[PDB]
Design an enzyme around this catalytic site. Sequence first.
Site, PDB file in Angstrom:
ATOM      1  N   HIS A 176       0.899  -1.141   0.000  1.00 13.37           N
ATOM      2  CA  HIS A 176       0.000   0.000   0.000  1.00 13.37           C
ATOM      3  C   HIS A 176       0.947   1.202   0.000  1.00 13.37           C
ATOM      4  O   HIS A 176       1.627   1.483   1.002  1.00 13.37           O
ATOM      5  CB  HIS A 176      -0.889  -0.008   1.240  1.00 13.37           C
ATOM      6  CG  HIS A 176      -2.024  -0.983   1.149  1.00 13.37           C
ATOM      7  ND1 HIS A 176      -2.729  -1.416   2.250  1.00 13.37           N
ATOM      8  CD2 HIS A 176      -2.561  -1.621   0.081  1.00 13.37           C
ATOM      9  CE1 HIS A 176      -3.647  -2.285   1.864  1.00 13.37           C
ATOM     10  NE2 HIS A 176      -3.566  -2.426   0.553  1.00 13.37           N
ATOM     11  N   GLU A 209       1.605   3.238   3.142  1.00 12.10           N
ATOM     12  CA  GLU A 209       1.908   2.583   4.417  1.00 12.10           C
ATOM     13  C   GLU A 209       3.401   2.344   4.539  1.00 12.10           C
ATOM     14  O   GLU A 209       3.901   1.257   4.229  1.00 12.10           O
ATOM     15  CB  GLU A 209       1.130   1.286   4.540  1.00 12.10           C
ATOM     16  CG  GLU A 209      -0.350   1.524   4.754  1.00 12.10           C
ATOM     17  CD  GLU A 209      -1.181   0.305   4.480  1.00 12.10           C
ATOM     18  OE1 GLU A 209      -2.319   0.465   4.008  1.00 12.10           O
ATOM     19  OE2 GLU A 209      -0.702  -0.814   4.737  1.00 12.10           O
ATOM     20  N   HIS A 228       1.852  -3.909   6.929  1.00 11.88           N
ATOM     21  CA  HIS A 228       0.891  -2.814   6.694  1.00 11.88           C
ATOM     22  C   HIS A 228       0.847  -1.778   7.811  1.00 11.88           C
ATOM     23  O   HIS A 228       1.316  -2.021   8.921  1.00 11.88           O
ATOM     24  CB  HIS A 228      -0.541  -3.361   6.581  1.00 11.88           C
ATOM     25  CG  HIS A 228      -0.842  -4.049   5.288  1.00 11.88           C
ATOM     26  ND1 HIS A 228      -1.260  -3.371   4.163  1.00 11.88           N
ATOM     27  CD2 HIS A 228      -0.794  -5.358   4.943  1.00 11.88           C
ATOM     28  CE1 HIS A 228      -1.457  -4.235   3.182  1.00 11.88           C
ATOM     29  NE2 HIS A 228      -1.182  -5.449   3.631  1.00 11.88           N
ATOM     30  N   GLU A 268      -0.174  -5.234  11.066  1.00 14.33           N
ATOM     31  CA  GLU A 268      -0.598  -3.823  11.001  1.00 14.33           C
ATOM     32  C   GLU A 268       0.276  -3.132  12.036  1.00 14.33           C
ATOM     33  O   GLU A 268      -0.051  -3.088  13.211  1.00 14.33           O
ATOM     34  CB  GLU A 268      -2.095  -3.690  11.328  1.00 14.33           C
ATOM     35  CG  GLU A 268      -3.007  -4.214  10.196  1.00 14.33           C
ATOM     36  CD  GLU A 268      -3.005  -3.340   8.934  1.00 14.33           C
ATOM     37  OE1 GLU A 268      -3.590  -3.758   7.915  1.00 14.33           O
ATOM     38  OE2 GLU A 268      -2.437  -2.234   8.964  1.00 14.33           O
TER      39      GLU A 268
HETATM   40 ZN   LIG Z   1      -2.588  -1.737   4.459  1.00 13.57          ZN
END
Ligand SMILES: [Zn+2]
Length: 393
Positions: free
Chosen positions: A66, A69, A173, A264
């Site tokens: 992403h 990110e 992420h 994350e």
């Molecule tokens: Zn992400």
Amino acid sequence: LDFNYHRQEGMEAFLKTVAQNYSSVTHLHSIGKSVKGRNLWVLVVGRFPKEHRIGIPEFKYVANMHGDETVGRELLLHLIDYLVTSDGKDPEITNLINSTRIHIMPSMNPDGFEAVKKPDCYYSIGRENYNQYDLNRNFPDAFEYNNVSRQPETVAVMKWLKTETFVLSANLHGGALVASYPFDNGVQATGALYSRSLTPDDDVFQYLAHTYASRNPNMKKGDECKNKMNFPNGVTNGYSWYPLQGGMQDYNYIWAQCFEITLELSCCKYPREEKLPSFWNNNKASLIEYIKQVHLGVKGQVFDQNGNPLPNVIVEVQDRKHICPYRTNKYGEYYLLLLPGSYIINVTVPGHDPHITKVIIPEKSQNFSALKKDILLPFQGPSCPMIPLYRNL
Ligand SMILES: [Zn+2]
Ligand SMILES: *[C@@H]1O[C@H](CO)[C@@H](O[C@@H]2O[C@H](CO)[C@@H](O)[C@H](O)[C@H]2NC(C)=O)[C@H](O)[C@H]1NC(C)=O
């Protein structure tokens, strides 16, 4: 390395340089190019880098899929350095770097990253690949046709995932602070109605998420991200979070034979530079403890009575049959991440009665290698259509 951001030039640089200064235990290459000609550099770190070796399990860390990110982009470069410079001085880490072959991919979507010039916590010009596609919504889906334009990066990776017998993974992420395990998508058969999609190995995946988060002071807090939802112990199922269609995590596990979970690592998707030291700090031990998990359960290779590794054979535990069944590699070896316990593996070689072979998986290992168990069948001796298998299942 320094603790500021590293756009393409400098990160690339770093890498290439780590390439030179440490060629004895590193190798840098590119599994492809973005839709902008940007390079998909991977850096492998191992005793004998450049070539898989029977016995030593393969491990990867893909991050930055992403655009915006950024924490993981930076954690992976910094992880990279750590390893090379710890090699030789710190024993434990050295034992590891010896015993495994670690592949690192700091940024799967660099066009996205480069694209943003005005950094920010919740939104930006980056994230999507250059064709505005979501790279984590772009892979084949074992649950519901994800008919979509497979993108350069998506494809590069699919092939790359083919280049090695990857055993354990995790794509990084930012935007929340939790460790998400599979499946990210589901079906009633998996329990979508309970808001949970479980895998044949939900226990190892759970243990794996907890492994990482237990070691992240903040990820462990559970009550951490403001404008976001939070989890307890910092771990959660993908579905119980948000049914994700066509994500890399599900792919790796369905069609690539390896376990990927989603880390994350930051609430704020693109935090200020001054915060990296801390990010490195609250993750260090977690990256290491996770990699280290590539040694759970058993491994070995399978031969017929003429001591010939039979490749493409199916080797899985009695009650853990996968939608697309786990087969041996070209070297006829097999890897199965499992938790401490007694198992029964069913070795089923094409056109044969499945061969039973029992194994007790320890309960604490003194080395950094899974349990070795070779299989001698008492005789002699394509993956799966990338189409929603579970759907019509
Ligand atoms: Zn992400
Ligand atoms: C881990 O692997 C390293 C490989 O670099 C081993 O150390 C080197 O071993 C070679 C043998 O060919 C020696 O000539 C070098 O002097 C060693 N390098 C140094 C100074 O570390 C190391 O012994 C291995 N340790 C294990 C198996 O745990």
